[PDB]
């Protein structure tokens, strides 16, 4: 009787079923991931942030669901992307030896879900969640993500790739999950190279984006932590799909 109004919107209705039968999807097409048991991921899952103040969630509080849901992902075949969700899954969805965050388990688990509990309750709090702006940057859903990322990063080794949207004001914006948190996670011992993918889309007059202000910030952050940088002009998203698709 002590729940708060928060900014954000509430927990996605059917957040529980959807979790358990996404859950259920994946090992069906990955029988690689057969040996998860998904009431027990369920049930990690809804432990880190059930009965807690929404907005003191930490990294551990996701570590058993991290655990249940440990997968081997090809180290070499990662592919990060900046707010072009869509073309950068098209892409794993035909090149299926190459993976993005929500290829993994985890990743399809949370993928488009909001979530949040209350302190002391059982109740999932449909009503709201913190947005993490104007309420706490400490929530269920942020936290989840700042941290299967990180973890995402870490693992990656040799040559990984970045997907990043031309079209932006900001080809590259230190303001996103890709450059706060994977940009810096990614090891020098086991990634020699940080190879973007600029997408392009309508937004101008064709040139080239890897000159762009941004673009040379990410060499910059990139090259300083000992990782060679590389730039690549997608001009044709289309024509690259379908290169892809039919080779």
């Known amino acids: 009787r002590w729940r708060q109004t928060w900014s954000g919107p509430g927990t996605t209705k059917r957040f529980p079923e959807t979790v358990l039968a996404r859950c259920v999807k994946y090992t069906e097409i990955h029988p690689e991931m057969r040996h998860v048991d998904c009431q027990s991921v369920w049930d990690a899952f809804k432990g880190a942030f059930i009965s807690k103040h929404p907005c003191n969630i930490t990294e551990e509080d996701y570590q058993p669901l991290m655990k249940l849901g440990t997968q081997t992902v090809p180290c070499n075949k990662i592919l990060l992307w900046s707010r072009i969700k869509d073309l950068a899954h098209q892409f794993t969805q035909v090149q299926r ?22 302190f002391n309750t059982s109740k999932i709090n449909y009503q709201s969640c913190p947005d993490w702006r104007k309420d706490c940057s400490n929530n269920p ?21 970045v997907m990043l949207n031309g079209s932006r004001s900001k080809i590259f914006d230190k303001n996103s999950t890709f450059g706060s948190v994977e940009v810096h996670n990614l090891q020098p011992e086991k990634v020699q190279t940080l190879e973007a993918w ?18 040379k910030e990410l060499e910059s952050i990139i090259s300083k932590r000992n990782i060679q940088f590389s730039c690549k002009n997608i001009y044709r998203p289309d024509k690259f799909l379908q290169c892809v698709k039919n080779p």
């Open 97 to 118: 030896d190459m993976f993005t965050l929500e290829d993994t388990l985890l990743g399809y688990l949370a993928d488009d879900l909001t979530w949040c509990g209350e």
């Open 198 to 215: 600029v997408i392009h889309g309508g937004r101008e007059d064709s040139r080239d984006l890897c000159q762009d202000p941004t673009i």
């Open 141 to 161: 859903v942020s936290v989840f993500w700042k941290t299967v990322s990180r973890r995402f990063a870490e693992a990656a080794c040799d040559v990984v790739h």
